[PDB]
Amino acid sequence: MVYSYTEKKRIRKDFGKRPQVLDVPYLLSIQLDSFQKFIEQDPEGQYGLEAAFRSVFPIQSYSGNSELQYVSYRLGEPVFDVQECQIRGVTYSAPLRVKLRLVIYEREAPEGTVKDIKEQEVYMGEIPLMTDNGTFVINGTERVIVSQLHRSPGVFFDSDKGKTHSSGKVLYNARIIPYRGSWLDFEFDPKDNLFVRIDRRRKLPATIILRALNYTTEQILDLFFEKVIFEIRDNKLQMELVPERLRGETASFDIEANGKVYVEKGRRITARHIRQLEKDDVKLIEVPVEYIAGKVVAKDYIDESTGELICAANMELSLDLLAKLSQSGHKRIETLFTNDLDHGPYISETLRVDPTNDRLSALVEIYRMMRPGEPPTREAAESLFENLFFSEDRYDLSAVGRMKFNRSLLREEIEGSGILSKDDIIDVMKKLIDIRNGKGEVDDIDHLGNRRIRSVGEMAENQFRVGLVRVERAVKERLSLGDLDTLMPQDMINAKPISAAVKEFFGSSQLSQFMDQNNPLSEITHKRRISALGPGGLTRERAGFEVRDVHPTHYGRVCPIETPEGPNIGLINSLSVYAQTNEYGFLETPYRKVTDGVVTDEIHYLSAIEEGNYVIAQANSNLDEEGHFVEDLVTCRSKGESSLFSRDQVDYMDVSTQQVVSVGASLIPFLEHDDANRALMGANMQRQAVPTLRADKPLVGTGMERAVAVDSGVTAVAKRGGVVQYVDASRIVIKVNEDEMYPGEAGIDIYNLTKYTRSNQNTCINQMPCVSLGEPVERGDVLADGPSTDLGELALGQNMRVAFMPWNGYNFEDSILVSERVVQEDRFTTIHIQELACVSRDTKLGPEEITADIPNVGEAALSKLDESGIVYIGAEVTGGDILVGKVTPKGETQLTPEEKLLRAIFGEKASDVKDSSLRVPNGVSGTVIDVQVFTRDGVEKDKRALEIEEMQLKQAKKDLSEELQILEAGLFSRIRAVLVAGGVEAEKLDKLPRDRWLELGLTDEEKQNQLEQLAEQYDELKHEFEKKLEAKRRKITQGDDLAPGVLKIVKVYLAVKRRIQPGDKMAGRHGNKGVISKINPIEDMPYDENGTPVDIVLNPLGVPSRMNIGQILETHLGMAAKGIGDKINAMLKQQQEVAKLREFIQRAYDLGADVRQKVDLSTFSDEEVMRLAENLRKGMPIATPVFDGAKEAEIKELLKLGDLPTSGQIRLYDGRTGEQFERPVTVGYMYMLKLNHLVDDKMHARSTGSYSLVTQQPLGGKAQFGGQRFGEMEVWALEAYGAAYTLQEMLTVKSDDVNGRTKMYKNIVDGNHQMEPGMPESFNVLLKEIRSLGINIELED
């Protein structure tokens, strides 16, 4: 109840100090949920394949009265499972079956149909599926897909830092970004002119687009400005009063209110005068005529006498114009505001710049600017403008785009048309003018509320949509030439482009890369990875200093610690433990609701925008029993800041202290005691560890090991756990209990563990059981632990006894000193697996045969080859041994006498057939593990192929017959009970087979009903098992459909053990790394007064400068834990009774200062206590959470419990001199990992090899036997030394002097040591290159 079966075997001592509200999520929910939403059926057309089909289908020809109606779709069962798919090297995918019908409409009768062919489902392409762990097995690989962090479609306003024209003038711009389509932009000139940049083309005034929307000059001036009315009647020339707008202005003359002076000429302009004027109800008042001189007419007043009128908008007025309008009777004149206090002159200047005022003129102008080719004919311009924006299939903002668009402009409605209208462009322009005016502010583009996440499902949906559009384009053509005989497969189903697009996206993309397979931690980290790069992302060199900086919005969403170092720092991030993605695609993080002064248990997920308003408390703020805050003033985040608030002003609380760290950074104990960058290095280095031979749990952990181990999927977890029936190194069979059971056919659970298997990084993957026999298990318990996992806990390192002291300079700088005892116990010894393959491929001259006998090959070479030419399993091959014996034919149809006598003396071939055999590459050694020969259909079966097929059939029958045995035993038990009910012969009945001829008939009812039904069920069971067995046999024995050219394939695996050595690299999980300097003998290492030497010696000089106190704290804590473990081991050694041992374990499990763990041994069974105590001989595995855990006092009392000094330092004696070191030395246990950088892959040397055809210089890199590159800086250094002869021998003799190389080699062999230089080939190549142009360059004498 309190603890599960897998946890009662070994309980970590949690230091706690704070309860946990909600548990850590599945840690893999993003990829799983995204692909589930992409794949699963949806009754509505919301998302996925159904959404794409509804987007394109239904489709009809151009008035051809023929349409294809789409109804539902399905995915067929995969033809291979995951394991055999990986072992074969093929893609794991499912066929796509789509059901659609052809309808033929009546030509004579409108809206009538004549035919309706409802043909069955058809096939187009195969959609790859993801495994249970979120991986896409394509081409026999893993190929995880990385999520992308991009800018959400919508509207963004920016100020470009206001430094472009060097005048200090800040420039505002607005951008409209759709999900798919062409961008739109607005910009501000330094002369304050509205300019647009459509599709990033040359800048044009906004007035062309503004007029293209059927907007006249009067209407634009009316909508974009607040027009005022000027009344000139009986020469009074009054003005309407708008005191609200009249804020800043100078009175040109005396201002009187209803004939009484209100404001004098040039009087006070303060708010008091405005308030006094507004208080008095005053009608229109007269003004001096000089004020109207600067005014501009807005409307276009018409003269009632003659058709002539002053329609010149955006123009001032003249003194004669006043008389002209008075003659026409214009009593009221409409003029815009023309006030510059907060508003200003806009839009009008752009209309003055551009004189086009017609929709046709604007359309042709934008057609010329967009397309500088052929001028339009009133149809090209209209159609092109309709295609640019406001087109259903050309321009499209997603629902998130519409949401952001409406929210940024303060519109209540969220949902809306997915295509932009006429009004929103006007609203955007008005908003930009508003920001320029002063009201409003620019938004942050690095704000996490403006950045979205694209997962695998959405990208796959987009690729499928593109492919289906391409298919549709071809489909539309055929319908014009369609008769009634055509069906759906004959209607251009076109699987080719669907499959091509989908496979191109999955197999070859920037965001679909090989997944890391070192540890489960690297797989977990890679799966939940956020990347800013990609197709639609931001490139490395385009990234400024601000996009790769941590933001105050990164709190509970992305980790500020985990990130790559050099190129991609800040561009690749990792999700936090509790972070999850909103419905629209924005990051979220949970918080606890706070009501009054008590924090509640209900949990709300807040995004980046919502959390910006509330006041959020801290996770590590103390609370009372009732939930109230124990102190009045608490620390909170209000708006991107930190300050103290009252106990009542808070609104939310953090769920836990791990909210801001990712999975990788959660496994670092004492993270708060490490420097940020060194902890970054430690977190990045924890993922490069190599799983060892034997797993070893960490003594000082965190408690996240169980979650990482279970959620990664390397282990084997029970799903309907009952009791364990049969155990083996390769199988576990569990008898599911009766309480939960599927009715009928009984049922058992069979788990086939994956033995030694090559991973992506050429490491080893192996699973071994954890249950012994007859041991009851529950659902979710761990049965087998995969690579680097001990009893269901992440264990990717080993517990090393460490002394912090300088030792004769052998730990100088970052080096590490290691004892020989560490080497002897095979710690840090890893298994590496390699795959080698050879293919027999047909040729014109004849087929390629794989045979044991190899011409011109001695008998010693054929010793390790079988009768079929394939190595025996288990043979140890080194150097250049032959693996597969393959012969290539040669062509000769002219039998000359010498070849005739050659054939006479020797075999019929006379060794004409060349040999091309798969040999081990030099420097590679190991034991042959597996051979996986594949053959084509029709070709003769290989001799070993029969043996492998036999073993596969044996395994299938062995794992299939268990359920048959169970079912037949149940049937026999039922028959025995029936015969016991009547006419029981007991042992006499049990002795004869077939229930002693079904116990005759006995009673009529039993014979007619019981015995007959039992016999019928028995026969049906036999027939069912038999058909299933021959189905398995047929599936096993088949000819693999190979490539048209290939004929046979053989794959060979080699496994080798890599031991530790001075060249190897070793590092802890606190950012402290190094290389081994020496493997010291046991008697030379320092020892304490008990004679036990240390295993590792490190330098104290590396602690203070790097600022890692977690190192020392973990060392002390590991020493305390191992002291308690030693006490338990010693007390178990002396055969002490169970009572005292239980008392000691209970005392050790109740330590700490009010921890939240309540483990008690009172309810523990005695055998359970014995097993748990036997599991703590090697140490007590205590756990400290990330930002709360053990303190100095608790560590010291833990030390005092185990009879160890509280200072953490003991007296060491020199193993060489026998003298005691003058000062005490810090000794303890530190968890040390083994990184993937070994000198067996980093040691290289070359004297002579191969050179390129061009420039004749040595090749580069290992596996090609290349030479080290002597770059430009090395030559600069040689020049600065004055070494001219060394430089000359570097440039000519060693690299490019073709004759010089041979001459110098001949001199060296003879012993001359003479140079004889020449002309490098590269200069000749350069001369030929320059001469290949029209330029002549020559070497004059």
């Binding site: 090297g89 093929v90 040729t843 003396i905 091309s916």
Partner: protein, 380 residues
């Protein structure tokens, strides 16, 4: 595809402007020159060594005569005595026995490099190698009497001789058997033996040509429109490739139509189809069809991988109508192999058997068919 191979070894030169650059390979002649450059030779000796190693074939034997080498030198005091010494020095290089004039010399030099105490050194040094080599080619029943030695000793001397390398210098080759078969013409078995074509890449080429040429033309960055600058080159290329694939498919369909029986039941059922037979079928001239189907290759479950192997005009004056000499040769090979241990296989007897079977062929032709790819089993 149930089983798919892992990607074959391939690479391309990166971070280097002349992409793919190259990679030097070491051949037999290059290795011989490298060995020559590291031994003390005079200038005349060096010239002779270069001249004689230039003539080394792929198998490691000298193709040109020694007197012809002397004539090639064309200088006095370089008579055959000197070139003989130089060649004999050259022979003892890393592929021991390389640059050998004949088989006898190769065995002599191979046996020379030994402990001089092997059980049958003098037995096969000259009695077997330098003499009665033709006898050793046959059963060598009279060789024991000729050499005055017991047959038991010869039974081990023959094995000792066979222990030597027959063709030294062929273990140095660095070429890779990458001359695999594209099989651009794929074929599967159906109710009518349908024939398809793979590796067309026509949709891919069309898409790439579009996205490049029409992509630049549709792009509005350049002034005007590239309606013919780039758009009207991809169309020409696509049309040419489509026409080529169409005529190839038509020729293949004609070939399978006239040669259905070769693929059905027995393999040796080819009609003697001529170029005019397909020319009239496809209404195209014979020259184009001959140039089209002269190295194109098909992928058949049982038939040969070629498109010219079927094109035979070998009527051979068959009794009933006409026949193909390919089937006649196949039948002769099958019958000759399946015969008595004596295996007479006489040309007259084979011709009589073929005539009885219905193939009216002269006794002199059958000798040519047999000698093309076989030898008479003691028919003389």
């Amino acid at each position: 595809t149930a089983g798919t191979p892992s990607g074959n070894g391939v690479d391309y030169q990166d971070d280097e402007l002349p992409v793919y650059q190259g990679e030097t390979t070491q051949s037999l002649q290059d290795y011989l020159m490298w060995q020559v450059e590291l031994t003390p030779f005079t200038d005349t000796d060096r010239a002779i060594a270069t001249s004689i190693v230039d003539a080394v074939d792929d198998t490691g034997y000298l193709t040109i005569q020694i007197e012809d080498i002397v004539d090639s030198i064309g200088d006095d005091e370089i008579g055959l005595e000197e070139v003989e010494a130089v060649l004999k020095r050259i022979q003892r290089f890393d592929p021991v026995g390389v640059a050998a004039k004949d088989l006898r010399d190769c065995l002599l030099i191979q046996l020379s490099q030994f402990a001089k105490e092997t059980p049958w050194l003098e037995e096969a040094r000259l009695i077997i190698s330098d003499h009665l080599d033709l006898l050793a080619n046959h059963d060598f029943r009279t060789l024991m009497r000729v050499t005055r030695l017991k047959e038991e000793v010869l039974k081990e001397a023959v094995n000792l001789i066979q222990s030597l390398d027959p063709r030294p210098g062929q273990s140095i080759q660095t070429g890779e058997p990458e001359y695999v078969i594209p099989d651009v013409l794929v074929r599967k078995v159906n109710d009518r033996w349908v024939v398809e074509l793979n590796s067309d890449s026509l949709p891919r080429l069309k898409i790439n040509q579009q996205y490049a040429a029409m992509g630049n033309s549709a792009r509005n960055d350049a002034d005007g429109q590239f309606i013919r600058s780039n758009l009207q080159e991809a169309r020409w290329l696509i049309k040419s490739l489509e026409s080529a694939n169409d005529t190839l498919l038509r020729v293949s369909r004609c070939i399978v139509e006239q040669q259905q029986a070769f693929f059905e039941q027995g393999e040796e059922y080819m009609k003697p189809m001529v170029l005019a037979d397909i020319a009239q079928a496809v209404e195209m001239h014979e020259s184009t069809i001959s140039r089209v189907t002269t190295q194109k290759y098909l992928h058949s479950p049982r038939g040969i991988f070629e498109l010219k192997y079927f094109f035979s005009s070998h009527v051979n004056t068959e009794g009933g109508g006409e026949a193909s000499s390919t089937a006649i040769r196949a039948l002769v090979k099958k019958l000759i192999a399946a015969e008595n241990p004596a295996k007479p296989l006489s040309d007259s007897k084979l011709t009589s058997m073929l005539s009885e079977q219905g193939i009216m062929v002269a006794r002199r032709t059958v000798a040519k068919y047999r000698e093309s790819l076989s030898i008479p089993p003691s028919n003389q």
